[PDB]
Amino acid sequence: SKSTAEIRQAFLDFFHSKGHQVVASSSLVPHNDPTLLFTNAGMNQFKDVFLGLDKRNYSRATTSQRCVRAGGKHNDLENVGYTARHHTFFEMLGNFSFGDYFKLDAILFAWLLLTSEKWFALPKERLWVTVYESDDEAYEIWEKEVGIPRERIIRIGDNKGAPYASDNFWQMGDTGPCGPCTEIFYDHGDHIWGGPPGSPEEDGDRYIEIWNIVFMQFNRQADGTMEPLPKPSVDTGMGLERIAAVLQHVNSNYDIDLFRTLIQAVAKVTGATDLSNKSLRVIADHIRSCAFLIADGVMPSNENRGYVLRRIIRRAVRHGNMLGAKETFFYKLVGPLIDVMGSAGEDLKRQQAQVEQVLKTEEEQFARTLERGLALLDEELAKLSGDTLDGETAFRLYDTYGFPVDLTADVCRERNIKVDEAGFEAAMEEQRRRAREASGF
């Protein structure tokens, strides 16, 4: 079967052969978008094109975009290690139409690449599609133009409990380009738990969302109102890791060639032997987001972007500790990561030594309190009455040991213990008041 690198290239070759300009992945960090924490989709760097504020020499494009979803509008951090399909860092394979072609041709391109004997040749019978409930045009295209049996075309309304809050209406953020969308799912088989989209068991890893095709129609405002874009456009994105899993005949993203090699490296540096332990997958995921974010200019800190990075590094280090890592290990995964990323890791390779030292320094800094903080948390859990750790203890771990609340929550979750987030926030606010009182005017 094709390697991850070959799949990435074949996707780009396909759209290039269809007249799409190949554009390089943008950085994970925008210089000119105050509303965006980290790049979360291929469309981010073309936001102004969709808005009609910018025009390129090309009206159609294709990219393999590095994305991080660990904060802001799209945040999958807490899913990592718990599903076969979620990462913090991942590549989104995309094609874009800037007032060029629209619904029918976007759907046809996607179906062709996926199912043609000349291309990916996926078994058509295992593919399901969803459309926005009110998108009658998309429904008809799938039914009559493509020929998907009706039983595998699923209409999804505003299933997130609010107007335009839906799995089939995609939004870049609270503001920005958005529109109804249609998604293609692959059924991995009845040996995996889960049901199709719209079913009670839809959240399972059996029927996995491979490719989202967005019909960009509006610019959402802060009020929540939808202002139409000047030209209806197309924004698509397919998870490289998810399609690689399908193509390599495995069910989990973590079983693709890229992650198999990376997870082996994690076991090596931590001393772990059980290759099935979820901490190996969490760490393999976390090195990708951490190393690339640093390569793209983020430095660990206690505010904004730097704090998300710090949070992820420390959580990864914590997982390494649980695996029994005896010495500083996280920075040792940069080399192995570069070796599996191909041309998609060129920016990281260019800055290898710098990224390594940043990660080494951060882990060493955290090691000053990690073991001691874990010992305290263990003591507090051993005498804990109930299923919820008190907010005062969470705050103490934060204030004294530099444990982000979500890191503490991660440890507790592994023991079926919750954290009183409200109590933690009340303790934070109490400290803020003390600071205001002492500092004065």
Ligand X SMILES: C[C@H](N)C(=O)NS(=O)(=O)OC[C@H]1O[C@@H](n2cnc3c(N)ncnc32)[C@H](O)[C@@H]1O
Asked if 238 interacts with ligand X (CB under 6 A), we say yes
CA distance 7 to 343: 13
- Of 52-60, 234-242, 266-274, 299-307, which segment contacts ligand X by CB under 6 A? 234-242
CA distance 255 to 189: 16
Q: Roughly what angle, to the nearest 10 degrees, separates helices 352-367 and 334-341?
A: 140
| Residues in binding contact with ligand X, number by CB under 6 A | 21
Which member of 27, 129, 153, 235 binds ligand X (CB under 6 A)?
235
Contact between 300 and 313 (Cβ < 8 Å): yes
CA nearest neighbour of 374 among 392, 401, 406: 401
CA distance 14 to 28: 25
Q: How far is CA 371 from CA 315, 360, 387, in A?
A: 13, 17, 23
Partners of 128 in beta bridges:
185
CA nearest neighbour of 359 among 260, 292, 272: 292
Q: How far is the CB of 325 from ligand X (least distance, A)?
A: 25
Asked if 210 interacts with ligand X (CB under 6 A), we say yes
- Of 25-33, 55-63, 85-93, 195-203, which segment contacts ligand X by CB under 6 A? 85-93
Asked if 236 interacts with ligand X (CB under 6 A), we say yes
Asked if 288 interacts with ligand X (CB under 6 A), we say no
Asked if 206 interacts with ligand X (CB under 6 A), we say no
Q: How far is the CB of 68 from ligand X (least distance, A)?
A: 9
Asked if 41 interacts with ligand X (CB under 6 A), we say yes
Interface positions, 379-418, toward ligand X (CB under 6 A): none
Q: How far is the CB of 7 from ligand X (least distance, A)?
A: 13
Report the sign of the C-alpha dihedral through residues 245, 248, 254, 258, in that order: negative
Interface positions, 53-72, toward ligand X (CB under 6 A): 69
How many C-beta atoms surround the C-beta of residue 78 within 10 A? Answer: 13
Q: How far is the CB of 326 from ligand X (least distance, A)?
A: 31
DSSP line for 131-162 = EETT-HHHHHIIIIII---GGGEEEE--TTSB
- Of 55-63, 185-193, 235-243, 395-403, which segment contacts ligand X by CB under 6 A? 235-243
Contact between 244 and 258 (Cβ < 8 Å): yes
Q: How far is the CB of 177 from ligand X (least distance, A)?
A: 9
Which member of 36, 106, 214, 280 binds ligand X (CB under 6 A)?
214
- Of 54-62, 209-217, 258-266, 376-384, which segment contacts ligand X by CB under 6 A? 209-217
Asked if 239 interacts with ligand X (CB under 6 A), we say yes
Question: Biggest alpha carbon distance in the chain?
Answer: 72
Asked if 28 interacts with ligand X (CB under 6 A), we say no
Which member of 11, 38, 90, 96 binds ligand X (CB under 6 A)?
90
Asked if 173 interacts with ligand X (CB under 6 A), we say no
How many C-beta atoms surround the C-beta of residue 292 within 10 A? Answer: 26
Q: How far is the CB of 281 from ligand X (least distance, A)?
A: 12
- Of 129-137, 238-246, 377-385, 393-401, which segment contacts ligand X by CB under 6 A? 238-246
Place of tokens 């997870």: 263
DSSP line for 90-137 = EEEEEEEESSS--HHHHHHHHHHHHH-TTTT---GGGEEEEEETT-HH
Asked if 212 interacts with ligand X (CB under 6 A), we say yes
Contact between 294 and 358 (Cβ < 8 Å): yes
Asked if 242 interacts with ligand X (CB under 6 A), we say yes
Asked if 43 interacts with ligand X (CB under 6 A), we say yes
Asked if 120 interacts with ligand X (CB under 6 A), we say no
Asked if 170 interacts with ligand X (CB under 6 A), we say yes
CA nearest neighbour of 126 among 148, 141, 144: 148
Query: Which residue has its beta carbon closest to ligand X?
Result: 239
- Of 27-35, 115-123, 203-211, 363-371, which segment contacts ligand X by CB under 6 A? 203-211
Asked if 4 interacts with ligand X (CB under 6 A), we say no
CA–CA–CA angle 233, 132, 187 (5° rounding): 105
Q: Which residues bind ligand X (CB under 6 A)?
A: 41, 43, 69, 76, 86-87, 90, 92, 170, 209-212, 214, 235-239, 241-242
